[PDB]
Amino acid sequence: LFGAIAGFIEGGWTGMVDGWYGYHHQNEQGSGYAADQKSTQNAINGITNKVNSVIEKMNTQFTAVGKEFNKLERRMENLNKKVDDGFIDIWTYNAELLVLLENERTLDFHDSNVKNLYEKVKSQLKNNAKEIGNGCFEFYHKCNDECMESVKNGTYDYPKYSEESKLNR
Amino acid sequence: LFGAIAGFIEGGWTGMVDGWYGYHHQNEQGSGYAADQKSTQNAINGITNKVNSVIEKMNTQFTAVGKEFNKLERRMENLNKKVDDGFIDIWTYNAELLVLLENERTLDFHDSNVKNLYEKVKSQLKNNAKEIGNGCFEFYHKCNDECMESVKNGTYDYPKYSEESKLNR
Amino acid sequence: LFGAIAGFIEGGWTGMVDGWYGYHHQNEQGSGYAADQKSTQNAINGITNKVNSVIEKMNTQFTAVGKEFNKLERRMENLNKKVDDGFIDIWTYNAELLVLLENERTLDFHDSNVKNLYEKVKSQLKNNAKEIGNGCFEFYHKCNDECMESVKNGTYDYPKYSEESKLNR
Amino acid sequence: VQLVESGGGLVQPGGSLRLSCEASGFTLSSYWMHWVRQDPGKGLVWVAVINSDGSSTDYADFVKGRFTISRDNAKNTVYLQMNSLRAEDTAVYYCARAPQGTVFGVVIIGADGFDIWGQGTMVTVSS
Amino acid sequence: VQLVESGGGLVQPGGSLRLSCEASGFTLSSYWMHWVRQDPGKGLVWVAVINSDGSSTDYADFVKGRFTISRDNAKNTVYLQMNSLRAEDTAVYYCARAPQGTVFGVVIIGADGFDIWGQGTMVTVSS
Amino acid sequence: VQLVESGGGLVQPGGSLRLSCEASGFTLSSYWMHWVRQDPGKGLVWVAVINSDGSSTDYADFVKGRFTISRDNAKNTVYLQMNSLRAEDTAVYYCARAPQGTVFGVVIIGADGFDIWGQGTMVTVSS
Amino acid sequence: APMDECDAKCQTPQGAINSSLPFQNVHPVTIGECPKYVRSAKLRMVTGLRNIP
Amino acid sequence: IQMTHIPVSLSASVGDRVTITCRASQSISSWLAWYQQKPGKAPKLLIYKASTLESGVPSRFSGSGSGTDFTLTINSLQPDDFATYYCQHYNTYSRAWTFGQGTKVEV
Amino acid sequence: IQMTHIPVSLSASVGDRVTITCRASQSISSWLAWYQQKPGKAPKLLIYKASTLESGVPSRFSGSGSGTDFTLTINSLQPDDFATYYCQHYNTYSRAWTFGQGTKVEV
Amino acid sequence: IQMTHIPVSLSASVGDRVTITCRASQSISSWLAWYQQKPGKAPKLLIYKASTLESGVPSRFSGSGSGTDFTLTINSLQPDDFATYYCQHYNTYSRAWTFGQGTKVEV
Amino acid sequence: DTICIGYHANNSTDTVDTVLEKNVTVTHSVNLLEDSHNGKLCRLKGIAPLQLGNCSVAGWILGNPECELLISRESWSYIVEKPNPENGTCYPGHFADYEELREQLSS
């Protein structure tokens, strides 16, 4: 729905296992996978809340089932079967529709989180980096582990590298 | 879900009272808050329609409650209870869940509007203004109350200021 | 909700008949409409599956209605009528709310598809084209039916026209 | 609940008049107050509106600063003062009450329109 | 409702033939019409398809200009002309009807596949 | 199920000690194992945690590499080895079990907190 | 109603219904594989876009 | 914004359906109210939000519409239902209150 | 696009659950139709959209699957169910109609 | 993250509804666990996720709250419910386990 | 040279209702509600209905002398009875458990 998952990011990363969303950096000191703690924490909070909140609305059954009717009480038996089957049908429909709609909503939620993370990094970097388009930014200035950690932490210092990036651009 | 509310626009404005979404302008003639009538009107229409459309789907109860059974009609009584309580449960679910889901959607709706409004101003200003990122743009040309009102009204004259903005950029 | 339909793309195209979303191109070789087969196919798959999935969650009624009670069985008749009316009310609510919510979701889905198609074309073109803002791109280089078809097919050769587009820009 | 109107009478052209509405049964501070004039035989024309706090008032397109609307919640009254009256402004004037809105002034659920009107004061302009 | 086929027979290689389906029980102006063929003992393969107006027609990969499809809704018939036949084109030809799609040609809800088939016309190519 | 701890005793300052939890009734490989300490009469303080595979461990803020946590799932035992003990680190030590959620280590549905605790071993330091 | 020689799948006192649609508003009383009775007068589900020509 | 009434005047018998249509110069969503006024009296509100019934209004009144075309149906006309009916566009936001010309129902 | 059958032939006794699996060379979503043909006769359509049963087809037939792999199950095999079963990929959009090689159910 | 108790100590009688509040330095969503400890014994877990009763605990315990403020209520106090009650912030992700100071209920 | 991205519009008048809006014109839509019917009683899976005619279930089951045309009929899909049957129990009296017998004969 938001074009991030299965959109301009073709596939997932099997190498990062500490989060749902993360970064993959590559500088002269090596390559690495890191997992965004803030976004994944927010996603876990939201999904846990959603699942639990859905469950609590389904009050636990605290009763019993079963009645007996003699041959002259067929109308009673038909009414009882109608009540039981109707309640079963209503609850089955509720559960199935709830699962379907919530599944679609959760996938959209994850797509939105990935897109928002991409936009955050893009706005942080501004014209110091070039958008390759597969979800990656090629820096116009040399970046060490400190500046990569700054981008991950949200503390990127655009003015510091602005002069060097402008010359290379 | 869209990244505007609580995203790149951190908090709300207490000084704006005439609308949900709006503008905060600051030129040599002073500072001020204004409310986008069109966006807020559209949001009001949407939310009113949502609330009322939901409400009219549950017709008000018109009957009464209460039945009496003797000691030899216990199978009757349980059945009655099994209906009444059962129906209540369903309606409770159908209410609670509804609000939950609807609530989320409403918030997302508002988020979208803010995002959309922001994008509109982008499409109006192009390279005549610089994206600070906190939610606004610093103009590359002098703007008075007339051009600010044009920006709010959607009638921004990009060609008029293009030459002046190009020099300063 | 995403700003494509009734946003920066105001109206529809009656000249396109082979797809929900598509392109309208105008070069020295002429003007024409075309339909994005991939996006429309994905939309058809999604809409078909949603409608069918909603329908099969409701098992077809394979029973009968009708009961009779004598004068001294008023309580049974009231209970039966209450059961029937309550089931009808619950199912009417389910049908109406489902149609409302799914209709809003479907319109949002189509909006998202148009927005994603626009973003795909924008990302392919990059600075080789100018974003007018009404859903259109004005190329900085001469483009024939071959490069039009490349843009529609997704195989746009940006480096080939980069030098020519840079001069005109 | 009722609104009663007073002050309607015969005033010469270029004159002035001061209509007053008193509301018995409810509190004026929780209702927008509207002044609506109806020519004899003709339809209903909306004249003026005053807010719950007297800060925001609005007037029609045919009144060029002639009319001034005021409110007094302590006295439970709403006044409309007309000056420079012309021959066209001869009608039965009604006082209408409108509920406040949950969102800003727009009501989302419940009563919305002019629930309760007055009885009408006949204002006639002639020589 | 049924479809009857005619025109099949023995034709020499490099010949021509005309197959025709007539529909009884329904008006075929609101149905796509398909031509499939089954080799004796082999499986089913699809040859041609014609729309509900005759504007859009499609043909299989092995037929390259050899076959031409046509339809007469007033007469409730669908025709297939084969020219330049070869020994491979020896099979039982079936006429199938497919419901027109709700959106474009895709049916969202309702019947979707080839609901009603023909009886089969045997087309033989030999010397 | 039960957890039985052992190894507590009097140790001089600067000394070393070993604490061991043994499980009875469950597989230790499917739970995170926590070490908490409670000063006599005071509140509960968390000390250390060991994963379900012995790969990821964590320690509190007052443990500057003094304590080492370890696991043996074959024997269903958890070990905590303390060194450089000081006068402050005297308390009743408890072993706790926590469920391991499918998503990373977070539990979305079902039991999440410290379900089963031990009995406590008193570790005392003096001269 | 009079008796015809149909081959229907659902029967209501007002007449028979031959449809695979999931709902109906003809009659609560039904015999056979029948759609679910609802009190609505319009259940239309959109499959396309907003029409802005 | 302008409100137009169709028909300007109409006549019907007791026990007959009747439809009064209000058309808008622009799209006013569901911001419409239906009032009823008898001669020499004050109007009483019948419908707000184009569909909701005021408490005390008989169920024989039904409002329906959205956007630019709206309708008041008085099922089973009664002697106490012969008056002039007004459509009003009310919008507290944007400060827009406008009344229709009105339709007189007779017998 | 190519559609393949597993197994090519499958012999089972009366009253036994049967299962025919059709696999696609690409992802064809739920655009599948199961047909049945007895020797020397026109095919009859059993299932469309990989799950929906044509009117009149006995409930003993079942459809299942999406994407690339699909399955027709005949629980409680009956004597009239000994024929050749075909899986067809139909897509009116994109104009793709393709038949499977076929499966034979014997005694 | 620091977790504080209100009040530190409390006196209440049998059959009296009681309420212990725990406040967090930052927002910790619904990552709270309520434990109970009687003198010279291991704690027993009452509530997890700030609302869910652990299997086997009496229904009188009620957990509520979110964010910063959380509340544990022992409705209809009983003799076995006189102990020290601890609030814990547990987060397996981000690896944060922190215990409150404690709340002692007396008679 | 320009390329534009847009969508599809047609001459449809089909309308749907959404949560945000009412009476939204759409390009394509499906109707999930059945409103029409044949108008006449018809067979169900081949077996013809049993129309008792002027006599009721009591008259049919006791063998009322004035409707013997139902004696031959032995199989049916459903029973059709007039809303106010008149040719029932000719000799006046009470039919014990009449509604129970109707329930038994309904299956």
Automatic annotation (TrEMBL), chains A, B, C:
The SS bond pairs are C143-C147
Put simply, this protein is called Hemagglutinin HA2 chain
Gene name per UniProt: HA
Q: Which residues of the full protein are shown?
A: 345 to 513 of 565
From TrEMBL, chain G:
Q: How does it assemble?
A: Homotrimer of disulfide-linked HA1-HA2. Interacts with human CACNA1C.
Superkingdom, according to UniProt? Viruses
Record family assignment: Belongs to the influenza viruses hemagglutinin family.
Where does this polypeptide localize?
A: Host apical cell membrane
Give a short account of what the protein does: Binds to sialic acid-containing receptors on the cell surface, bringing about the attachment of the virus particle to the cell. This attachment induces virion internalization of about two third of the virus particles through clathrin-dependent endocytosis and about one third through a clathrin- and caveolin-independent pathway. Plays a major role in the determination of host range restriction and virulence. Class I viral fusion protein.
Per its record, how is this protein called by name?
Hemagglutinin
Q: Which residues form the signal peptide?
A: none
